[PDB]
Amino acid sequence: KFPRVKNWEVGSITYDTLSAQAQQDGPCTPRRCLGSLVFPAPEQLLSQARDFINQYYSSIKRSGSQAHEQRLQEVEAEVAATGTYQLRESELVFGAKQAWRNAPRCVGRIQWGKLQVFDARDCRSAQEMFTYICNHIKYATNRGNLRSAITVFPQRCPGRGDFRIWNSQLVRYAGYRQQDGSVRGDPANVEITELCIQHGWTPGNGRFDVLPLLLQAPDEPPELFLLPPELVLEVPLEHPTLEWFAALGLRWYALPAVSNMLLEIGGLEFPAAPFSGWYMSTEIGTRNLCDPHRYNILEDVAVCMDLDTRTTSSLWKDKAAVEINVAVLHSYQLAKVTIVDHHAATASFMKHLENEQKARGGCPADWAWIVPPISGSLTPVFHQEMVNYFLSPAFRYQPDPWK
Amino acid sequence: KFPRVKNWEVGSITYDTLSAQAQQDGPCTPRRCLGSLVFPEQLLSQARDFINQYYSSIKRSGSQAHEQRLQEVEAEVAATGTYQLRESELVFGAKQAWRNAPRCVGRIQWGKLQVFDARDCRSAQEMFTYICNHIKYATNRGNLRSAITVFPQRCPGRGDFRIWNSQLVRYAGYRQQDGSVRGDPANVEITELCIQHGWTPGNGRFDVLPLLLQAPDEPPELFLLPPELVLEVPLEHPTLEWFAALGLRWYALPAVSNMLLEIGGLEFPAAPFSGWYMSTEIGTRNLCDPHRYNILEDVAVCMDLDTRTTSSLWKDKAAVEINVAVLHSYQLAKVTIVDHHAATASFMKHLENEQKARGGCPADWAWIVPPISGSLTPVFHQEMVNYFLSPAFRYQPDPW
Ligand code: HEM
Ligand code: HEM
Ligand SMILES: N=C(Nc1ccc(CCNCc2cccc(NC(=N)c3cccs3)c2)cc1)c1cccs1
Ligand SMILES: N=C(Nc1ccc(CCNCc2cccc(NC(=N)c3cccs3)c2)cc1)c1cccs1
Ligand SMILES: C[C@H](O)[C@H](O)[C@H]1CNc2nc(N)[nH]c(=O)c2N1
Ligand SMILES: C[C@H](O)[C@H](O)[C@H]1CNc2nc(N)[nH]c(=O)c2N1
Ligand SMILES: [Cl-]
Ligand SMILES: [Cl-]
Ligand SMILES: [Gd]
Ligand SMILES: [Gd]
Ligand SMILES: [Zn+2]
After folding, report:
1. d(Cα A276, Cα A289) in Å, to the nearest integer?
2. After which residues is chain A discontinuous, taking C to N > 2.5 Å?
3. Does A143 touch chain B (CB under 8 A)?
4. Is B276 one of the catalytic residues?
5. Any idea which positions bind (6R)-L-erythro-5,6,7,8-tetrahydrobiopterin (chain B)?
6. Residue B192's closest CA among B169, B218, B165?
7. Deepest in the core among A251, A312, B179, B394, taking most CB within 10 A?
8. How far apart are CA B38 and CA A300, in angstroms?
9. Whole-number Å distance between alpha carbons of B221 and B131
């Protein structure tokens, strides 16, 4: 038997047959579930490459064709001669889309088929890397009409260091570890800020200072590049009916572009493959602005809203958090920057689940990450049971290049 | 082998060593996590294990009385096939089963539980008296007190005491000739049973259901709850004067009556327990779930919210004011209730106490994090380990 999966809003029942294809292992055992944790060789290369090629040729409905066999033979011969192999361009595009499709913590996978894949596997230097990244930022920002993209830098290979982007995203605000223990700017970026200053960046002193990019070419210390200010589209935050909100001087950036994850395709590894989509509004409104360990503006806003913050039972937190999220959505819509609210995102994810059940017999999904951080049970994904497992091609965490 | 558990708000680290004592097996494997699923004469070994637990907790470990109790239960099961709990063992086993319940955010309170020993019960008319005394004690005119009543255990060659209702207080669910449900859709099945067993149905959205109590080997008998025994809170809102006219209400006492209590290999299919509500249970789940009363759009219409675009966050604004109404209405009626911020702060304290007490604490993140304002509560940022300890409250098949 395969896991029986139930939607409790509808009563409907599916079986996740796809999970039985899970290659790598997760952190859970029959004795204990660790699903809530944030952080969970010629012959082994070949069976991963074979499986990936099988996936490619299924996607185009040419399984068992002559072209399928020849390509498997081709990969085998290259691995036997060199210990490794090169993806065809079409396989790279397919592999990056599958990795997105396979990502269990991504609620935006209804879009997985619409992904611009920039092939930067011929990149030679940190300077050319910066050029690829600027072109990515320009294409994806598209002056507010955001377009999903990934740029794939050269694969890891023996006898040469990795390409790495040290920043966790292409656009990050500085976090200045103030001496009195506190932080000015984004506390999530204190470490990368200190590394940037360490490498000669002249720091600012604001709360929304865009960080430079620390770019690492093989066997080279990271190099500092400043993003052209006209390349970094930002949204000033205001609230549709709370006019004093604008005076908080809050901003956020248009483009979420994760740059520190490793892309794995057919046993090949791409330690530098930054990817971007668009924001779901709770990421900015609830997490980035109201996490106690982030900008932590909740109490300041509620006090401005004249709420009774002396008792929890007034729900001043819930009320201020809702208005902050309203401000984010209003501000991005006003600026004409693509953004999706958590209701539409989770509804579209529910559609994705139904498509994937028909297409592949299941969908790896991490409930705790799919359910938005406010209003969870008001969205349909709350009531959907979900099976979490690791498929390849995949986006993976990897150690920071300085640790 | 000891899982590392991190709090991402504070950056603190602990190690759950208690998980190594997980007796049963959950649904997860290294291949796939099923954590989000709602439903995941060796009696001696379990009986042995619980006794050791007991005497260890009272610092009587391996003492004279320890070995004596051990040898008593061996004779009982040899003579009868089962054994009898001492009243103190039963109290300790009830408290431990609550303390071990991974999905309970209310466990800061676990040492304060009134155990009613109903194991001398026979016939459903007596069940009903035990239950009514439970309901009366636990309600306490609104100053709610946690309690469990423990009816006779299952044994071979003989039926079971079962409470057919999932809770002692449930509103009726009446299906309509247009398919819809007037009342609580969660209770459409027990409502048709109550009718099929003679109950005159109401026609209201908050008709309190009768109790279908079942003594062993007999059909269940309908018992009507004295309306003065069932404390109910009419729902009003502190500033939205029209909210009261919606006619919403809920009941004071959450009393779960369909779970099985397991202690030392013994099984009590009828052991209703009650505490008090966390406000999001009523204001978010019971009233705003699509498959329950589903009142969200009604409230948003009364608030004159723009309901044609999700991005107005009309669902979020309506949900908050409904939870406000619940908190205001219970406090105004002097019925104990806890908001999700106070409860999750208390559960965090419980986690620290349990870390020091036992080296960990089984917790089901998906159920501990509230259904609104998740990341505004500290539990959201707390990694958790889920595992099954005994004594335990377990799900069980419906009697029919
Ligand atoms: C197109 C619009 C998209 C939306 C609205 C979206 C939404 C989200 C959200 C809300 C998260 C959780 C982030 C967090 O809480 O830190 C997430 C995670 C993730 N997203 Fe998507 N995403 C989109 C596109 C993409 C694309 C284009 C890719 C890759 C090609 C991608 C891959 C991932 C991955 C791998 C994760 C997991 C990251 C982790 O484990 O930390 N997403 N996404
Ligand atoms: C004292 C105040 C208490 C509060 C505020 C509280 C709160 C909660 C909440 C919010 C849930 C989730 C229920 C749901 O979402 O359906 C829960 C579950 C649970 N509670 Fe507590 N509870 C309390 C007392 C108790 C007591 C006295 C017991 C037993 C002696 C108990 C045993 C359980 C169990 C076994 C579950 C799991 C239910 C399931 O898996 O369906 N709780 N509690
Ligand atoms: N950074 C840490 N913790 C940590 C914090 C957050 C995350 C999650 C990373 N998420 C950023 C992200 C990922 C994926 C999507 C988004 N948001 C988006 N909408 C998109 C980004 C790209 C395409 S869509 C944001 C992981 C570890 C650590 C502290 C100490 C050691 S590691
Ligand atoms: N039973 C179902 N599913 C299901 C639904 C809810 C739960 C959770 C149990 N709900 C009642 C409950 C349990 C525990 C605590 C509370 N609330 C309380 N605050 C307390 C109750 C007793 C002491 S505290 C409510 C489990 C399974 C089904 C639906 C349709 C067919 S079967
Ligand atoms: C402890 C817990 O795993 C952690 O706070 C998770 C919960 N769910 C999440 N879900 C999303 N989308 N993003 C997150 O950062 C987190 N954090
Ligand atoms: C599918 C999912 O497991 C289900 O909806 C769970 C999620 N978390 C929950 N948490 C609580 N407290 N109560 C619930 O009923 C649920 N339902
Ligand atoms: Cl972000
Ligand atoms: Cl309830
Ligand atoms: Gd105004
Ligand atoms: Gd009106
Ligand atoms: Zn698990």
Report:
1. 20
2. 40
3. no
4. yes
5. 36, 285, 366-367, 380
6. B165
7. A312
8. 38
9. 14
Peptide bond between residue A393 and the one before it cis (omega within 30 degrees of 0): yes
- As for chain B, the residues directly before each break of C–N over 2.5 Å are 40
Q: Identify all chain B residues contacting A27, using CB atoms and an 8 Å cutoff.
A: 3, 30, 33
Cβ–Cβ under 8 Å, residues B164 and B152? no
Distance of CA A36 to the CA centre of its chain: 18
A 10 A CB-CB count for B47 gives 23
Partners of residue B9 in chain A, C-beta under 8 Å: 291-293
Contact of A129 with A215, CB cutoff 8 Å: yes
Residue A373 contacts B where some CB pair is shorter than 8 Å: yes
Give the full edge-to-edge strand order of the sheet including B266-268.
B266-268, B260-263, B392-394
CA-derived radius of gyration, chain A: 22
* A110's tokens: 């209804």
Sign, CA torsion B390/B392/B397/B400: positive
- The answer on whether B366 is annotated among ligand-binding residues is yes
- CA–CA separation, A381 and A344 (whole Å): 11
Instruction: Answer whether B31 sits within 8 Å of A22, measured CB to CB.
Output: yes
Strand partners, A14: A5
B346, burial (CB in 10 Å: exposed 0-12, middle 13-18, buried 19+): middle
Q: How far is CA A35 from the centre of its chain?
A: 19
Alpha helices in B197-339 (DSSP H): 279-280, 287-288, 296-302, 314-332
Structure tokens at B193: 């049973």
CB contact at 8 A, B255 and B146? no
**Rounded Cα gap, residues B223 and B125, in angstroms:** 8
For B270, phi then psi, to 5°, come to -125, 105
Assess contact for B145 and B109: CB atoms under 8 A.
no
Structural contact between residues A98 and A115, judged by C-beta atoms closer than 8 angstroms: no
What is the Cα–Cα distance from B46 to B27, expressed in whole angstroms? Answer: 21
Determine whether B87 is an active site residue. no
**What is the experimental method?**
X-ray
Burial of A144 (0-12, 13-18, 19+ CB in 10 A): middle
Contact B183, B191 (CB under 8 A): yes
What residue ranges in B49-158 does DSSP mark as E strands?
Answer: 114-117, 147-150
**Shortest Cα distance from B19 to chain A (angstroms)?**
7
- Residue A308 and residue A304: Cα distance in Å, rounded? 11
How far, rounded to the nearest angstrom, does the alpha carbon of residue A174 sit from its chain's CA centroid?
20
Tokens representing A320 are: 């201020």
C-beta of residue B265 within 8 angstroms of C-beta of residue B43: yes
**Residue from B219, B221, A225, B218 nearest B210 by CA:** B221
Query: Can you tell me whether residue A234 is helix, strand or coil?
Result: strand
CA distances for A106 relative to A278, A353, B17, B242, angstroms: 12, 12, 32, 41
CA–CA distance, B374 with B382 (Å, rounded to integer): 11
| Phi and psi torsions of A58, nearest 5° | -70, -40
Amino acid identity for residue B165 in this structure? N
The SS3 of residue B237 is coil
Residue B345: count other Cβ atoms within 10 Å of its Cβ.
Answer: 16
- CA dihedral in degrees (A99, A104, A107, A112; nearest 10)? 20
**Quick one: which of B34, B32, B150, B37 has its CA closest to B95?**
B150
In sequence order, which residues have a C-beta less than 8 Å from that of residue B140 and are 6 or more positions away? none
3-state secondary structure at position B213? strand
- Distance, in Å, from the CA atom of A228 to the CA atom of A233, rounded to the nearest integer, reads 10
